[PDB]
Design a protein around this ligand. Sequence first.
Ligand SMILES: [K+]
Ligand SMILES: [K+]
Ligand SMILES: [K+]
Ligand SMILES: [K+]
Ligand SMILES: [K+]
Ligand SMILES: [K+]
Ligand SMILES: [K+]
Ligand SMILES: [K+]
Ligand SMILES: [K+]
Ligand SMILES: [K+]
Ligand SMILES: [K+]
Ligand SMILES: [K+]
Ligand SMILES: [K+]
Ligand SMILES: [K+]
Ligand SMILES: [K+]
Ligand SMILES: [K+]
Ligand SMILES: [Mg+2]
Ligand SMILES: [Mg+2]
Ligand SMILES: [Mg+2]
Ligand SMILES: [Mg+2]
Ligand SMILES: [Mg+2]
Ligand SMILES: [Mg+2]
Ligand SMILES: [Mg+2]
Ligand SMILES: [Mg+2]
Ligand SMILES: [Mg+2]
Ligand SMILES: [Mg+2]
Ligand SMILES: [Mg+2]
Ligand SMILES: [Mg+2]
Ligand SMILES: [Mg+2]
Ligand SMILES: [Mg+2]
Ligand SMILES: [Mg+2]
Ligand SMILES: [Mg+2]
Ligand SMILES: [Mg+2]
Ligand SMILES: [Mg+2]
Ligand SMILES: [Mg+2]
Ligand SMILES: [Mg+2]
Ligand SMILES: [Mg+2]
Ligand SMILES: [Mg+2]
Ligand SMILES: [Mg+2]
Ligand SMILES: [Mg+2]
Ligand SMILES: [Mg+2]
Ligand SMILES: [Mg+2]
Ligand SMILES: [Mg+2]
Ligand SMILES: [Mg+2]
Ligand SMILES: [Mg+2]
Ligand SMILES: [Mg+2]
Ligand SMILES: [Mg+2]
Ligand SMILES: [Mg+2]
Ligand SMILES: [Mg+2]
Ligand SMILES: [Mg+2]
Ligand SMILES: [Mg+2]
Ligand SMILES: [Mg+2]
Ligand SMILES: [Mg+2]
Ligand SMILES: [Mg+2]
Lengths: 54, 206, 55, 158, 172
Amino acid sequence: AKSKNHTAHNQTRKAHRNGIKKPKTYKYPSLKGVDPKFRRNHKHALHGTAKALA
Amino acid sequence: ARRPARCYRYQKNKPYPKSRYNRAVPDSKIRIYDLGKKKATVDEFPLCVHLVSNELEQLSSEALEAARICANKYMTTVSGRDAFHLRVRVHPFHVLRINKGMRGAWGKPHGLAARVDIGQIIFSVRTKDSNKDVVVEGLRRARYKFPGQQKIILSKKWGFTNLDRPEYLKKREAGEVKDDGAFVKFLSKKGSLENNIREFPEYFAA
Amino acid sequence: AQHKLVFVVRIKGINKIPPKPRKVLQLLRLTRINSGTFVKVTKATLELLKLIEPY
Amino acid sequence: GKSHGYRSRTRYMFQRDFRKHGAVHLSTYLKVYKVGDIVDIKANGSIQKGMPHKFYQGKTGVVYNVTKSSVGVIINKMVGNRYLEKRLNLRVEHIKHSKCRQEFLERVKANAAKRAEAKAQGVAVQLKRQPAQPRESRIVSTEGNVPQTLAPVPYETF
Amino acid sequence: MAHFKEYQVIGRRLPTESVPEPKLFRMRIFASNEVIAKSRYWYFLQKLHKVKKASGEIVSINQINEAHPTKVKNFGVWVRYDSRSGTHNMYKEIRDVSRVAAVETLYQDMAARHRARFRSIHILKVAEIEKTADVKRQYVKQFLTKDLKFPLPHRVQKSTKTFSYKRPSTFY
RNA sequence: GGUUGCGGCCAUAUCUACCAGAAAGCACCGUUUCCCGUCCGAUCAACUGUAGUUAAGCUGGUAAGAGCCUGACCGAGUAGUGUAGUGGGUGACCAUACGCGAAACUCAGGUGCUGCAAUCU
RNA sequence: CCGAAGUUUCCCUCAGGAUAGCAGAAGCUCGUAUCAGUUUUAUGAGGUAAAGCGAAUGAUUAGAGGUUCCGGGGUCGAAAUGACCUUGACCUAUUCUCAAACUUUAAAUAUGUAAGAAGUCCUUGUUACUUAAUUGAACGUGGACAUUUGAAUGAAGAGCUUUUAGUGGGCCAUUUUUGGUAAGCAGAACUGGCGAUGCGGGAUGAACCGAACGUAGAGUUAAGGUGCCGGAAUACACGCUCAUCAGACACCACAAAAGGUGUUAGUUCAUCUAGACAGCCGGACGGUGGCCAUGGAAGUCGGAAUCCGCUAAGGAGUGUGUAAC
RNA sequence: UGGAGAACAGAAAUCUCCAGUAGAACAAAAGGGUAAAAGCCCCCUUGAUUUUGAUUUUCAGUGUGAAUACAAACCAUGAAA
RNA sequence: GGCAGUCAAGCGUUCAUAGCGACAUUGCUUUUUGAUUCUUCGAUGUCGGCUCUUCCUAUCAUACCGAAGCAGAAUUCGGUAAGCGUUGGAUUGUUCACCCACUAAUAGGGAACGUGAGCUGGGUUUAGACCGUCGUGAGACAGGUUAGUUUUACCCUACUGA
Ligand SMILES: [K+]
Ligand SMILES: [K+]
Ligand SMILES: [K+]
Ligand SMILES: [K+]
Ligand SMILES: [K+]
Ligand SMILES: [K+]
Ligand SMILES: [K+]
Ligand SMILES: [K+]
Ligand SMILES: [K+]
Ligand SMILES: [K+]
Ligand SMILES: [K+]
Ligand SMILES: [K+]
Ligand SMILES: [K+]
Ligand SMILES: [K+]
Ligand SMILES: [K+]
Ligand SMILES: [K+]
Ligand SMILES: [Mg+2]
Ligand SMILES: [Mg+2]
Ligand SMILES: [Mg+2]
Ligand SMILES: [Mg+2]
Ligand SMILES: [Mg+2]
Ligand SMILES: [Mg+2]
Ligand SMILES: [Mg+2]
Ligand SMILES: [Mg+2]
Ligand SMILES: [Mg+2]
Ligand SMILES: [Mg+2]
Ligand SMILES: [Mg+2]
Ligand SMILES: [Mg+2]
Ligand SMILES: [Mg+2]
Ligand SMILES: [Mg+2]
Ligand SMILES: [Mg+2]
Ligand SMILES: [Mg+2]
Ligand SMILES: [Mg+2]
Ligand SMILES: [Mg+2]
Ligand SMILES: [Mg+2]
Ligand SMILES: [Mg+2]
Ligand SMILES: [Mg+2]
Ligand SMILES: [Mg+2]
Ligand SMILES: [Mg+2]
Ligand SMILES: [Mg+2]
Ligand SMILES: [Mg+2]
Ligand SMILES: [Mg+2]
Ligand SMILES: [Mg+2]
Ligand SMILES: [Mg+2]
Ligand SMILES: [Mg+2]
Ligand SMILES: [Mg+2]
Ligand SMILES: [Mg+2]
Ligand SMILES: [Mg+2]
Ligand SMILES: [Mg+2]
Ligand SMILES: [Mg+2]
Ligand SMILES: [Mg+2]
Ligand SMILES: [Mg+2]
Ligand SMILES: [Mg+2]
Ligand SMILES: [Mg+2]
């Protein structure tokens, strides 16, 4: 027989039990999707700075 | 018969006008909205009386016609066909549907209705001030054709203009009004000076 | 001078409160019928008191 | 059946403003985005390439990447009971620098001045903003301003 | 409401830089306390002027006592109120020793006779009718005749006990 | 201040009708061997600043001008709306309380501002 | 002691599963952070409510003026890019009324971001990237600035992980809302509930109002009540209402149009101490024949109204009206 | 699209001027977008290619489809950006 | 579907309202039929008639009245009224219908569409069979036709008497 199709009733209450957690931030995010030409150079730049604080 | 009007009394649905989406709708019962001496000039008929809705509701096209005919007939018998101008101020644009089980229940067009607010003018009549009692009676007779409560109100304005009776008089004593068939054109203190002096010679002359 | 301090009493119990006023009531430490607190008046606190007026 | 294409329900959202159709003015292309900049996303419907999905319209995020024609923006999207990080590649015509940040920096600067000025002058300064306060007391004279009595008006028809 | 007081309430739009001394508006408000009086003040100001409590300030609230609280006066009272159908003006007359007593009676009357609650009523004006010729209502006029006397027939004395050992008399 | 080149914002800059414009610039304007392009040296190309001209373009000004722009305690605290009641009303709907608050309308004002470079009674 | 779900996606799936969610348990790393179903300040986004249509699109009522090197009725007119009278068309200025799939405008509520040490400023290292370049970009060194370190309120600790149960028929109320004449009907939105929940109130009742529950004592109250049933004023106060079907408290256990010299208040016109309104009372004719009609008219088998008498008083005049001054 | 002009030629053929904010067109529904264009006509072409990654929508943040921005090549076009 | 209002353009020789009544519009009813799917699928016996009681009133008759386009007679509209009656038959399983006839009158309805341990079993609605249409066929038909087991009370209450 026919039934209910859809509702969001009760869904915000479920969502707020274990809260809506903001996603958590770090110093130093991933260089993921950053332009490869930039990344390739940036390796070379960081190499030299190590060989210099030594 | 047709379905009783109680079935379509209240504004339950969003407006459903005739349109490119809603093609095959029947004609309105009311076609004439202006009766009596519609050619009459603004100066002829100072007194305005209104029938006014006191209800948020829908009026059928059939009730508007029936009320029109009633109010006209009475005013023409007791005062004569050229003694008043009657304007119907609501046009039935909202199409009513009818189904005719509940699978596939979207209705077909049944008839037409006018959606009126509280305070909305349904009918207006302008006359000479002699003829107040007649017009008030003819509008009183019309009320029985409509559902809900309507009120009969004597307007402070001159005829169908938007001016209080003293205001209009002063503007006519000055040359600031000119006849434009049934209605009227007012001099604005704006626009080209040349074209104003064409249209309103009697102003300026003073 | 406009008043600088209000005292607030919770006058309604803890059932059938909408989410927004329910949060505000918790932020003012009013979590029980007839509990009360002092509030320093400012635009920031006046708009809280608007939200919880019926309670 | 139902329909949920990529631009479903955008009829008004991606319309140009009235009398503001046609070419994008050049200042849009001379703005310089740098990683870390905060930008607001607002699709220009005239530029079909590089266009954000309608969800991001009116969302603000941070630039994480700069390419020839475009910037990468990070947005936090709520999915279920948590925020996922989304990375968008937008052409610059659909982006503008957020003035929220521009006007915060002016305060950081102004605070620095005040704090320096305070040490050298040799006192102590309040640098936190305060909410609008209750009005203090005040005397209102009636000189050329005797109170004028009003009463409620009767009902009239019009 | 309650037992009424009458209050002068004086307010103004807040000063701007452009307009440093705004015009003061005054109302006489019948209300059972000051808190209600201030609320009514804004209620009416907002019907008349572009102003609202947020953009305005009360400069004064003062209770106005009756000048002669044991002189019997005939008051005219003009009222606006909302029926179920429409809105009406009305003149009524009330004989009492104070404006505050006249208004109590007015409110009770409009409730009795027209089922108009406090929310539905505006007191437009209250004024002592200085001369007896100017009283327009028969129900007041009849108390202004010379050497008025009248009996109170059919007196009923309230009993303290449930039983009485003699049939009561209604004489006076 | 004018003018040109390149602009920014993109009508306070647009539109209609008239009138004015020193100087310089800009322009129209003269020519067809060459590169080049056309049904057509009209456009586009080249050549001469020489023969001519402010007629037009352009710039400015005028107009109880149209449009546009700004403001107003103008309309209007109106319409609408968030929150509240064992409020009213047969109902349709409405009033009140604590808040937020338009659009049309009306009136007043306005009618390009400005950057880089060069040039000019 | 803690404590749900009837929702998401996929499935020959729709009385079932998997999946995510909600729930328990075990903790772990730390110890007042990072935070937050909230406000504020600043800054964005939005095309719903309203509004608009002498603004675009579409719909729509009415006249007015103007024009056909042409539409057509009337009639002259050899024919005429003729002569006009009149009806559609078209243009101009107006006018009445509308829109879920129209719109210049445009709320309220809801909604993104920010409000600092992972900061700010100064200084000058690295690179194969970038620059005309000793320019930038990104990441650094060293230096400086620390509690009023950059709004409010709160913080019951904050953060992190593994694992597993039940559930995956829902239903109701207020508000927004679609289909339908409507439904205790069907279907969505946000919140609160019932389900899973007793207790006081609404006689009674899953969901309404109040309020959520260890065992007791005392006090005070909520919602609802206080003639008697029944704990509590046959309290106080101003009015209204008499029903030969009165009425009597939300949800809720229904009544309308239309009417009433029932009674109460009120609005606006009118009269009135120079005497009204009632009622009893007399008279209600004379007269440039003014004036039509000659079957009569100093009103009638039909009237277009108009003079003149003494007077505190009128009128060519109806209730039967010989056809008649 | 309209106006005013030109043998046959007329309401409609083709030529010309003026007005024209898009009232047109853009394969195909509808909505959006577009005027020295995204429309119309002309010239040259094969980026409708190679190598694999990241990203957005639908979402479990799986797949498929579709799409976005780069990298490393090799090309097209254009005086060039 | 059924029944009733309001308004009054007209009809009614004349005359809106004796009697009627267009265009409209407000309701009531649950004797129609739909709509819905809440209850019952470890079963509430499923049409009609027969029998019998009681209830409603929206009154067909009978009582007493008002109105009339009420002279009389006949009739029509309306009030209080459900006290009292409301039938015999032909055809059909019928409900409904239809006709004959008598009558003061042959009103309308409800009570689990009253009433199957009260009947009956004509219809419908198992299994046999025929026809027509449909189907290649097995078979289908809210199409026609014919034949087809109707069970139990001694308990409780109710009622009737003792
Ligand atoms: K199913
Ligand atoms: K379903
Ligand atoms: K009516
Ligand atoms: K508008
Ligand atoms: K329009
Ligand atoms: K699970
Ligand atoms: K599961
Ligand atoms: K409960
Ligand atoms: K209860
Ligand atoms: K309470
Ligand atoms: K009892
Ligand atoms: K995908
Ligand atoms: K059923
Ligand atoms: K069953
Ligand atoms: K018989
Ligand atoms: K047999
Ligand atoms: Mg389900
Ligand atoms: Mg489905
Ligand atoms: Mg019916
Ligand atoms: Mg609907
Ligand atoms: Mg769809
Ligand atoms: Mg593409
Ligand atoms: Mg040339
Ligand atoms: Mg010139
Ligand atoms: Mg509540
Ligand atoms: Mg618990
Ligand atoms: Mg499969
Ligand atoms: Mg089961
Ligand atoms: Mg809209
Ligand atoms: Mg929309
Ligand atoms: Mg609207
Ligand atoms: Mg929303
Ligand atoms: Mg499981
Ligand atoms: Mg399922
Ligand atoms: Mg299940
Ligand atoms: Mg259901
Ligand atoms: Mg269950
Ligand atoms: Mg009850
Ligand atoms: Mg007691
Ligand atoms: Mg009534
Ligand atoms: Mg994915
Ligand atoms: Mg696809
Ligand atoms: Mg059983
Ligand atoms: Mg059984
Ligand atoms: Mg049984
Ligand atoms: Mg009866
Ligand atoms: Mg029944
Ligand atoms: Mg039965
Ligand atoms: Mg049996
Ligand atoms: Mg039976
Ligand atoms: Mg039985
Ligand atoms: Mg049988
Ligand atoms: Mg058989
Ligand atoms: Mg025995």
